Design a protein around this ligand. Structure first.
Ligand SMILES: O=P(O)(O)O[C@H]1[C@H](OP(=O)(O)O)[C@@H](OP(=O)(O)O)[C@H](OP(=O)(O)O)[C@@H](OP(=O)(O)O)[C@H]1OP(=O)(O)O
Lengths: 579, 142, 600, 396
């Protein structure tokens, strides 16, 4: 019922006496204990008048503590926090700049209807203040109000009031009007952040240098939004940004990189500005892969893009993207990926002595992605595919089951970009007919015995061994069994009649896969029909594939290179997936 | 039968724990944890009954406190659900508007009350009048 | 009482860190170990507080590896409070030390052998609580004697009964059925309902393996229940809880009676029926209080009687009334009553005298599920529908299962999609019901539909086709949600591939439109599904030679031929080649109507 | 910008938090507890998007720090901040642990309203911060491998051997589950090589308790390092109870048609990646003592009723992931014992699976012998995962 709720004794009644004791070092303690309480989920709502009364103080720690408490009620239950607006108001006038800032920020974190009446004017007064810490708040709090409903005409006042303090003396202050503004501007009527520009640009790229870690970053971001028109406009902006191989190891660099690359449309190299820039951009990226793991990941997810658009930049620096045994799987994968993309026609020497390293390590997922990477390699550089296929044999003879199976599947894709060139090896691959438990590996063999059928006189009792447990088989293994036992009949008869019966038997009659049924039929409607015209639709030349997959749509590439810093650069997806 | 009775605050702290089955201390500590994870995560809308390991739990909360009985699967939910409430009124009477700190500072008394109402994993005495009468006689002894 | 205890507790509380806390605890342990080891005697008050402080620390987690001897001395005190604290310590920290057990066992002998009910109480509780073999061996024989003696207080008999119950559970072999049987049963007539309760719990456990021995309790239990459920408001005021007269005793009495078949003596069985109908009546009577505690006590008794009725499974009129009353709980604020009603109705559905009773409430069940928030209540709504579904119901039930599915949360889909497939198959009178069900099933919840099920549909469609152009339109007007999902594309790209013809004439479902639509799915699908569409797509040039050119240029394209995959690269090559090369009578001899299945 | 900061303990209980923008309710927290803190077969990354909400996070000891928005935020920003929050924090109270978080609720709140206004990484270096933060953090502080072992060929094998246990209701509630495991190591390595071993998070370091014991050779300080015994030995033993991957669900449908027939249909679902094969599958569906006989039907594997067993036994050689399969039986009952409901024994399974139901993954084993001539690149290394049923039971 209301059992255990009494407030005539217990912990709450105790704290109530403590919040009224006239020894402030005991009041302070109470309010620590109360804040403690909220966080563990207790109902301190009944102590509210008593906590509020503790603001009637000289003491700063004590006022600051009451504030922390009211702030807990801010998003939590907004109503509660409102009950003491009549104290935020006549509490942004006090001296101590610390207190003024403290009371403004708090009001802006409240969200109900009656927040406007009391916040309007005292924010008008806060943006005009001797202390940059109070304008630095007043600033960020303009944003806050924007969220609670209203295009607010006076807000047109504020909307401007932000602008005018972008030409402010403090970089903490400015770089904050900006970050405030640049997000205000993503609720878009068509003209905002509006352009007093050469000033906007000139006074920002000076804020940018005396700035903090974080002031830099949101500035760099506001830039890239704007479009220049001329060479020397772009040029000068870029040299000013350039010193950003700097502080925030990672967001600072990559917001620099963002800018230096929207403004990469120039008359390049009559004189070589273009060629200095692209030289410059090598080192700072490079050094990100020495920072923290998480950030390495974002940086790598950005290098990925970057390296599709301007593959010049890191052409020479394949060395940083080498796998360190102790990195996280997710930083191992994104590296491997870029190791293929920068995989030139030269380095494949070492790149391959690396991928052989990994494919023999103890992390299974990564070993599989290694051997596949050794396919990606050979199918993007033929001046090496030969050495690949050798590398792959090494591993197949080391016997590690999961290394063998991944190795075979790559061998096929390799037997297909470079057809009729590695026919010798087939018997080395058939040594290991034994232990291909995985279903992909099998369909890799079967298709191998599929083409190159005549090169093995023993290609017969190979296929017969699989028919035993013909079910128990991935349907993709049977699809591969069928196409490959009619690649065998369009050549060898009579010895094959033993089987091509028992086989096509099941695709059309036993198996219930209606897609298998269709493809089984289609065939019987060719072979047990006409021995010549079956050939020309089936053994028809497969065209040479190219390196089809790993590569992004260049329209989309551009858009994402404009988002270099953000989430879109991690997901590789336009924003509108996550509105 | 009742396997154990816990009283527990939101924050996971045990204020009473009574076992009626053989368990090691680790296992006890484990169970008190498991019970907390299940019960704090359920909002007023859920039932007061929930299957737990190979038994079940009836619980209700009062202010910051979850009262829980773990009982056999075939035991009558609503009987136990109201045993909990019958026990809390006696507690309320016996401490005069009971609060949590009552249970902390008089924890050894709390086991007197439990033992009056529960024993050998069964409801013992259900009348609030008789239990009070006995508790107040017990209090006045030396 | 113990200021030193209160202060320790408050200091523990005032601690601003698990470190500070641990420091104050060790300080205490140091102090207690001195004073126990020390030379100045402790007066009782101190042994009492310090033993109590160690119990407290135990209950915070930490280890207590001493104090037991000081707690055991408290058993031998003549001060209640000292004894209590002592009995609590050994009840919570049970130590195996073969010595201390002996001394505890003496302390029990003396408190039992006293004749002070309080000390008998602590003693008997300690026994119930720990209940160690050695304790059973010391006292298992004596407890019955205390339980039946003409002179022991009621409170003591209550406690003896349950202690006796504990020892029988822990050590049956020490609790043979001696000469106390009839006097235990006799306690069921006591005036003191607490004693009646205690005795009923004990006898119940005892009836399990010893029914015949306690055969006599049936009649006594019946006469007592019925006296309880009929008594007025000025009767049993002690045991009256929110206007429900002795609810826990009533529940216990209906539970004792579940150890036995219907009373054998016809009068008795009569009485019990008056009883059961009196309880059932009371269910229909409106509340005497708006406090949920009242309905809960009344419904405790209602539910247990309902269990007694099921277990007897011998009074059809009571079973029907039970169902109908459960039937009315399905529409109820209380999630608790909904849950229990649905549960208890699943039991009734498997029973002859009650299956058709339960059917009566389908409407109510389908309407509660439809509106129900709680997941576990939903689950049981569905479990019940499954349990009542027969030839009559199947179409109703399946229809609503599918209706529910379109807006159903994710938690539930899997279980429902499963029951549907199954009910469809056990019951559908005619091939054509099935197909209408499975295609919708797949349109709404196909990513949960088995392999067999989307296969096995089309293993049967063959033998009675005549809805190939239903299948097609549904598949199609399904496919043209900017929503629709994978197994739809699989069976929908299959259906239209094979008979799009019966709907390519309809002009807003043309061949070109059909195609483009499939191809609005293509580049989001899997490969064995692109496998299908790269076969679908070729049957299309044949039936529809009107759009052969738009087909041909998706096959020749890069993404189809230079496709990483074996099948995609194999099919996009082969099929481009079948539509360009050979003849057209050779085209038609390849993507024809599809020769049909056998029967297993 | 940043929509929420949440510090969670290892249980995934939100210790302390602050929502900075109102588009992030109860929904965000449980999202992040469910799909990250208690991830199962999910591919970890530092960022994840679920129901249009993005999630950044750092792990520190037993703590999770987590940043959240519904916006196209500055990816690199968020992380750097979280690194410096962890700089700052440690400059008040040392480690980043539950304990230290627990003691410093009021400090932590204070830093947050300073380090991070509305979501924008505001000024926040240690000494720069004194001026605005009034509070003070509360601080708190061989004989198993003879010498001269030589092998032409330096090899090592690791076997992760796990037993997965389950009791589950008919509705699919995990009532209890636990895994028991060990890493068996078999190594033929010259010399006295020190090994450096790495794995994922999954192990921290009749009522099952989480525990992990090591071989005497193991040193702890991240990772595990040791000079192994030669040949075969047990590196670590453990038991775990959170975040187990139940390879199969068993969905029972037992319907008592009266007191004479009994309809039992049972469906099992393989809940692991499709490319992996589970083997040696048995399902054991019990039957009551008074059963004339049984008509069983199934279209995967083979099944037979066994009278002395009082059970139907259904066997399946292989089942890959993300498949379903179904047995149906029709049972026939002669009802002597008039009364006493049949108390159903659970359905149990056997199976074998080529991964760890605990989630354990071996990430590295680095070998370094100082004196002798060989290098980890030289060492041949096989891992295997055998996961096995223990008592894996579903009520029906
Ligand atoms: O044995 P001592 O060191 O002489 O002091 C104790 C101690 O007093 P303090 O707590 O102020 O140190 C007791 O509290 P505990 O830490 O032992 O629990 C207190 O006990 P009570 O508050 O329960 O009475 C007891 O008082 P007393 O011995 O009069 O019962 C008192 O001994 P002193 O009389 O010497 O101060």
């Amino acid at each position: 019922s209301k059992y255990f709720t009494t407030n005539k004794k217990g912990e709450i009644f105790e704290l109530k006496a403590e919040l009224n004791n006239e020894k402030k070092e005991k009041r302070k303690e109470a309010v620590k204990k109360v804040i403690a309480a909220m966080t563990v989920g207790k109902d301190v709502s009944s102590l509210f008048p008593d906590v509020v009364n503790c603001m009637q103080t000289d003491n700063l720690e004590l006022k600051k503590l009451v504030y922390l408490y009211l702030m807990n009620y801010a998003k939590s239950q907004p109503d509660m926090a409102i009950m003491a607006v009549n104290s935020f108001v006549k509490d942004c006038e006090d001296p101590n700049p610390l207190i003024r800032a403290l009371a403004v920020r708090t009001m802006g974190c409240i969200r109900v209807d009656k927040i406007t009446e009391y916040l309007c004017e005292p924010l008008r007064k806060c943006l005009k203040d001797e202390d940059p810490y109070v304008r630095k708040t007043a600033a960020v709090c303009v944003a806050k109000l924007h969220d609670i409903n209203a295009q607010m005409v006076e807000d047109q006042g504020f909307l401007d009031s932000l602008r005018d303090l972008i030409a402010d003396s403090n970089p903490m202050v400015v770089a904050n009007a900006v970050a405030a503004l640049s997000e205000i501007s993503e609720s878009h009527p068509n003209s905002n952040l509006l352009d007093l520009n050469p000033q906007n640009i000139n006074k920002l790229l000076t804020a940018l240098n005396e700035c903090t870690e974080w002031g830099q970053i949101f500035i760099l971001d506001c830039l890239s939004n704007y479009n220049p028109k001329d060479d020397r406009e772009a040029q000068s902006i870029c040299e000013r940004v350039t010193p950003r191989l700097s502080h925030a190891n990672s967001a600072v660099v990559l917001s620099a990189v963002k800018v230096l690359m929207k403004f990469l449309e120039l008359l390049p190299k009559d004189s070589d500005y273009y060629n200095m820039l692209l030289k410059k951009l090598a080192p700072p990226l490079v050094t990100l892969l020495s920072g923290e793991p998480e950030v390495q990941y974002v940086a790598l997810r950005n290098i990925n893009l970057i390296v599709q658009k301007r593959p010049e930049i890191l052409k020479q620096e394949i060395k940083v993207f080498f796998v360190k045994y102790n990195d996280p799987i997710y930083v191992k994968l994104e590296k491997l990926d870029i190791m293929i993309r920068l995989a030139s026609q030269a380095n494949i020497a070492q790149v391959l002595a690396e991928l052989k390293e990994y494919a023999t390590e103890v992390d299974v997922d990564f070993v599989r992605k290694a051997v596949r990477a050794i396919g990606r390699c050979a199918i993007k550089v033929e001046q090496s595919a030969e050495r690949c296929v050798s590398t792959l044999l090494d591993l197949i003879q080391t016997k590690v089951n999961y290394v063998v199976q991944e190795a075979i599947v790559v061998i096929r894709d390799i037997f297909r970009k470079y057809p009729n060139k590695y026919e010798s090896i087939i018997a080395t691959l058939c040594e290991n007919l034994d232990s291909l438990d995985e279903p992909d590996a099998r369909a890799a063999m079967i298709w191998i015995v599929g083409e190159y059928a005549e090169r093995i006189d023993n290609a017969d009792e190979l296929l017969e061994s699989f028919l035993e447990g013909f079910h128990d088989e991935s349907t993709q293994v049977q699809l591969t069994l069928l196409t490959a036992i009619v690649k065998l009949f369009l050549k060898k008869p009579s010895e094959t009649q033993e089987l091509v019966q028992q086989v096509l038997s099941l695709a059309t009659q036993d198996s219930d896969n209606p897609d298998l049924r269709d493809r089984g039929y289609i065939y019987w409607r060719l072979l047990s029909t006409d021995p010549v015209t079956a050939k020309e639709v089936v053994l028809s030349e497969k065209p040479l594939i190219s390196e089809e997959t790993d590569l992004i749509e260049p329209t989309l590439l551009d858009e994402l290179i404009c988002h270099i810093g953000s989430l879109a650069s991690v997901y590789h997806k336009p924003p509108n997936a996550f509105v | 039968m009742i396997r154990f009775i816990l009283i527990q605050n939101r924050a996971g702290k045990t204020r009473l724990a009574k076992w009626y089955m053989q368990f090691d201390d680790d296992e006890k500590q484990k169970l008190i944890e498991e019970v907390h994870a299940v019960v704090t995560v359920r909002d007023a809308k859920h039932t007061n009954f929930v299957e737990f390991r190979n038994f079940k739990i009836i619980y209700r909360r009062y202010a910051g406190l979850y009262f829980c009985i773990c009982v056999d699967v075939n035991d009558n939910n609503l009987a136990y659900l109201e045993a909990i409430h019958n026990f809390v009124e006696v507690l309320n009477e016996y401490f005069h508007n009971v609060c949590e700190l009552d249970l902390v500072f008089n924890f050894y008394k709390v086991y007197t009350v439990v033992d009056e109402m529960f024993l050998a994993g069964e409801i013992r005495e259900t009348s609030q009048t008789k239990v009070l009468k006995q508790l107040l006689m017990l209090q006045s002894l030396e | 009482g113990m200021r030193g205890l209160a202060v320790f507790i408050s200091d523990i509380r005032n601690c601003k860190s698990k470190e500070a806390e641990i420091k104050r605890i060790n300080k205490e342990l140091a102090n207690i170990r001195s004073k126990f080891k020390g030379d100045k005697a402790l007066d009782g008050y101190s042994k009492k507080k310090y033993v109590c402080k160690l119990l407290f620390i135990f209950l915070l987690g930490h280890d207590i590896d001493f104090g037991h001897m000081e707690a055991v001395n408290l058993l031998s005190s003549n001060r209640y409070t000292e004894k209590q604290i002592g009995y609590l310590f050994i009840s919570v920290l049970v130590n195996s030390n073969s010595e201390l057990i002996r001394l505890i066992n003496n302390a029990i002998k003396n408190d039992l052998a006293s004749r002070n009910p309080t000390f008998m109480g602590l003693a008997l509780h300690c026994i119930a609580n720990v209940g160690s073999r050695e304790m059973a061996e010391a006292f298992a024989g004596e407890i019955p004697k205390i339980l039946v003696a003409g002179d022991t207080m009621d409170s003591v008999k209550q406690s003896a009964a349950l202690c006796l119950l504990r020892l029988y559970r822990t050590s049956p072999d020490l609790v043979p059925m001696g000469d106390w049987t009839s006097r235990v049963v006799h306690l069921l007539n006591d005036q003191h309902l607490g004693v009646v309760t205690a005795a009923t719990s004990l006898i119940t456990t005892l009836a399990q393996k010893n029914p015949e021995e306690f055969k006599t309790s049936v009649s006594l239990a019946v006469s007592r229940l019925s006296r309880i459920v009929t008594s007025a408001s000025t009767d049993l005021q002690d045991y009256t809880y929110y206007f429900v007269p002795a609810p826990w005793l009533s529940v216990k009495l209906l539970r004792l009676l579940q150890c036995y078949p219907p009373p054998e003596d016809p009068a008795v069985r009569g009485r019990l029926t008056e009883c059961l109908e009196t309880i059932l009546n009371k269910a229909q009577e409106p509340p005497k209080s708006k406090k949920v505690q009242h309905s809960n006590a009344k419904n405790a008794v209602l539910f247990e009687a309902i269990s007694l009725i099921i277990h007897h499974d011998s009074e059809p009129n009571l079973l029907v009334r039970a169902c109908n009353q459960l039937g009315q709980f399905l529409q109820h604020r209380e999630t608790n009553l909904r849950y229990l009603a649905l549960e208890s109705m699943c039991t009734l559905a498997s029973s002859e005298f009650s299956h058709e009773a339960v059917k009566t409430h389908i409407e109510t069940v389908i309407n509660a599920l439809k509106t129900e928030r709680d997941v576990s209540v939903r689950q049981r709504a569905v479990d019940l529908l499954y349990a009542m579904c027969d030839r009559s119901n199947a179409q109703q039930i399946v229809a609503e299962m599918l209706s529910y599915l379109e807006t159903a949360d994710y938690s539930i889909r899997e279980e429902i999609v499963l029951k549907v497939a199954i009910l469809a198959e056990k019951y559908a009178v005619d091939y054509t019901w099935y197909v209408d069900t499975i295609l919708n099933l797949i349109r709404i919840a196909g990513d949960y539909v088995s392999e067999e099920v989307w296969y096995r549909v089309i293993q049967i469609v063959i033998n009675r086709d005549d809805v190939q152009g239903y299948a097609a339109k549904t598949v199609f007007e399904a496919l043209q949600a900017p929503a629709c999902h994978e197994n739809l594309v699989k069976v929908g790209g299959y259906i239209l591939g094979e008979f799009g013809n019966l709907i390519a004439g309809d002009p807003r479902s043309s061949p070109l439109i059909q195609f483009n639509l499939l191809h609005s799915k293509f580049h989001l699908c899997s490969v064995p599904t692109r496998a299908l569409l790269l076969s679908t797509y070729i049957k299309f040039v044949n039936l529809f030679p009107e759009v052969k050119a738009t087909i041909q240029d998706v096959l020749r394209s890069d993404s189809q031929l230079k496709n990483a995959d074996v099948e995609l690269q194999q099919r996009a090559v082969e099929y481009l080649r079948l539509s360009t090369v050979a003849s057209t009578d050779i085209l038609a001899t390849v993507l024809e109507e599809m020769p049909p299945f056998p029967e297993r | 910008m940043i929509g929420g900061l949440f510090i969670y303990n290892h249980k995934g209980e939100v210790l302390i938090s602050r929502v900075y923008r109102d588009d992030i309710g109860r929904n965000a927290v449980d999202a992040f507890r469910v799909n990250v803190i208690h991830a199962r077969q999910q591919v970890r990354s530092p960022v994840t998007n679920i129901a249009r909400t993005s999630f950044f996070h750092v792990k520190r000891s037993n703590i999770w720090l987590a940043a959240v928005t519904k916006q196209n935020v500055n990816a690199a920003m968020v992380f750097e901040f979280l690194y410096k929050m962890c700089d700052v924090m440690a400059a008040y109270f040392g480690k980043i642990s539950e304990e230290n978080i627990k003691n410093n609720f009021v400090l932590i709140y204070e830093l947050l309203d300073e380090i991070l206004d509305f979501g924008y990484p505001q000024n926040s270096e240690t000494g720069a911060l004194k001026t605005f933060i009034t509070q003070q953090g509360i601080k708190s502080q061989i004989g198993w491998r003879r010498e001269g072992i030589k092998y032409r060929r330096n090899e090592l094998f690791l076997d992760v051997l796990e037993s997965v246990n389950l009791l589950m209701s008919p509705q699919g509630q995990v009532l209890s589950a636990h895994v028991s495991g060990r890493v068996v190591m078999k190594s033929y390595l010259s010399g006295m090589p020190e090994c450096k071993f790495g794995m994922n998070d999954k192990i921290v370091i009749s009522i099952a308790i989480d525990d992990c014991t090591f071989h005497q050779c193991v040193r702890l300080s991240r990772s595990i390092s040791f000079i192994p015994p030669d040949g075969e030995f047990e590196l670590m033993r453990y038991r775990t109870t959170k975040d187990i991957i139940l390879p199969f669900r068993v969905i029972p449908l037992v319907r008592e048609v009266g007191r004479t027939k009994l309809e039992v249909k049972v469906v099992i679902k393989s809940n692991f990646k499709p490319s992996l094969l589970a083997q040696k599958i048995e399902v054991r569906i019990p039957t009551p003592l008074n059963t004339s006989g049984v008509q069983v039907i199934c279209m995967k594997g083979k099944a037979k009723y066994k009278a002395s067993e009082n059970a139907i036994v259904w066997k399946i050689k292989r089942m890959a992931g993300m498949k379903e399969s179904q047995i149906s039986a029709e049972i026939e009952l002669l009802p002597t014992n008039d009364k006493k409901k049949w108390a159903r024994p659970p359905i149990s399974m056997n199976f074998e699976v080529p991964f760890a139901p605990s989630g354990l993954k071996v990430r590295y084993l680095k070998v370094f012998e100082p004196k002798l001539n060989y290098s980890d690149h030289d060492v041949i290394k096989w891992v295997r995962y055998i996961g096995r049923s223990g008592i894996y039971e579903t009520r029906c």
